[PDB]
Copies of this chain bind each other. A is one copy, B any other.
Amino acid sequence: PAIDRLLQIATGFMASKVLLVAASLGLFTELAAGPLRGEELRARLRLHPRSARDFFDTLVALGVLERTNGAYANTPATAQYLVRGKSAYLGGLLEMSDARMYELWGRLDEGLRTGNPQNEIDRLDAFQQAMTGLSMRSAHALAEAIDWSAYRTVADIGCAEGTVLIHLLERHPHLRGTGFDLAAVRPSFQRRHEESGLGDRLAFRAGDFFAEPLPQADALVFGHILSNWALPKAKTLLRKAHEALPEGGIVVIYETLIDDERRENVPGLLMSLTMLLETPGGFEYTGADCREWLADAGFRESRVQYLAGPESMVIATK
């Protein structure tokens, strides 16, 4: 029935919490060495004997854990994506949802009634690990979705620790890259930079993009940037991208974009409510919204293109 599906959505916070706590405990990382029986897994996770077995079996029943002859083990998906240290690890997103977003979303009604965020308005490394997991599939797709051989240089605006840019340059040996972010991010960028071995091919530029021009490059990337800010400041960033680009250069913007008709992309619409809860004036937008802003900024051509999972990009040519 339609009502059974409706109630399953309504009570989805229970199974969500089961998986979020398992991620917070690093349960899947503890199983990366091999299968463990319930008593051993409980001891490693420091869980109480009352409900540990129920907890593990719930994960099995949800399809996010294997159990064979009394030993729990990762599924192919949890092995690939929820084991810490692996390149495709996105568990940082679940750890952040468990530590912060679950309780923040508990304040949705107040956000809806006031229109004001419901948050405070390590730590940095927690935010960066959540962002890496959010942008993980999109960063790989970004390296394949555009013919990068046509550009010499790329500047990632709001680059954080530089994961997207580093993968782009590793994937395309000809590229030179510049990451742009606040000065407090430089150490995290410098660490990833040194670990990549990319050397002189990659550089960091410290600054505030609401007070300083952007680095000049053949391509400029905006990953999960514009959705954080009220529309006039996003329009300011699009103008600065135009000024930083040469003729034929491109601006690339990717988000969990809402469908143009605003009736299908659930992660995008949910993201817009996260922006409500987290920011004074951010919101999630549609590809059509962005193409209007880009034409207004002076770009001559633009298209919307699917990326990965719920995320999409808008590309414009100066």
Min CB gap A87→B, angstroms: 14
Min CB gap A108→B, angstroms: 5
Knowing A273-B54, A276-B54 are in contact, say whether A266-B17 is a contact too (CB < 8 A).
no
Which residues of chain A (162-185) have a CB below 8 Å from chain B? none
A2 engages B265 (CB within 8 Å): no
B6 engages A64 (CB within 8 Å): yes
CA distance A284 to B284 in the complex (A): 42
Q: Is A152 an interface residue (CB 8 A)?
A: no
Q: Identify the stretch in A74-82, A142-150, A193-201, A215-223 within 8 Å (CB) of chain B at 4 or more residues.
A: A74-82
Q: Is A13 an interface residue (CB 8 A)?
A: yes
Chain B residue at minimum C-beta to C-beta distance from A130: B7
Contacts of A16 in B (CB 8 A): 9-13, 16
Min CB gap A81→B, angstroms: 5
Contacts of A102 in B (CB 8 A): 13, 106
Write out, one digit per residue, whether chain A residues 111-154 have a CB within 8 A of any chain B CB (1) or not (0).
11111100000000000000000000000000000000000000
Instruction: Give how many copies assemble into the complex.
Output: 2
B17 engages A105 (CB within 8 Å): yes
Q: Is A97 an interface residue (CB 8 A)?
A: yes
Which residues of chain A (28-53) have a CB below 8 Å from chain B? 46-53
B2 engages A54 (CB within 8 Å): no
Q: Is A3 an interface residue (CB 8 A)?
A: yes
Min CB gap A270→B, angstroms: 5
CA distance A82 to B2 in the complex (A): 12
Contacts of A49 in B (CB 8 A): 115
Contacts of A90 in B (CB 8 A): 3, 7
B112 engages A2 (CB within 8 Å): no
| Chain A interface, DSSP helix/strand/loop, else mixed | helix
Q: Is A253 an interface residue (CB 8 A)?
A: no
B112 engages A3 (CB within 8 Å): no
Residues of A within 8 A of B (CB): 1-7, 9-21, 23-25, 46-55, 57-58, 60-64, 67, 75-78, 80-82, 90, 93-94, 97-98, 101-103, 105-106, 108-109, 111-116, 258, 262-267, 269-270, 272-274, 276, 283-284, 309
Task: Provide 21 A-B residue pairs closer than 8 Å at the C-beta atoms, listed in order of the A residue.
Answer: A2-B63, A3-B80, A3-B81, A5-B77, A6-B77, A6-B78, A7-B90, A9-B62, A10-B20, A10-B93, A11-B16, A11-B93, A18-B273, A21-B109, A47-B112, A51-B111, A51-B283, A55-B273, A58-B266, A58-B269, A60-B263
* 10 extra interface residue pairs, beta carbon distance < 8 Å, beyond A16-B16, A61-B263: A3-B77, A7-B309, A9-B12, A10-B19, A14-B101, A18-B270, A25-B109, A51-B112, A54-B273, A98-B109
When A and B form their complex, which 5 residue pairs have the shortest distance between CB atoms, in order from nearest? A48-B115, A12-B12, A50-B115, A12-B16, A2-B77
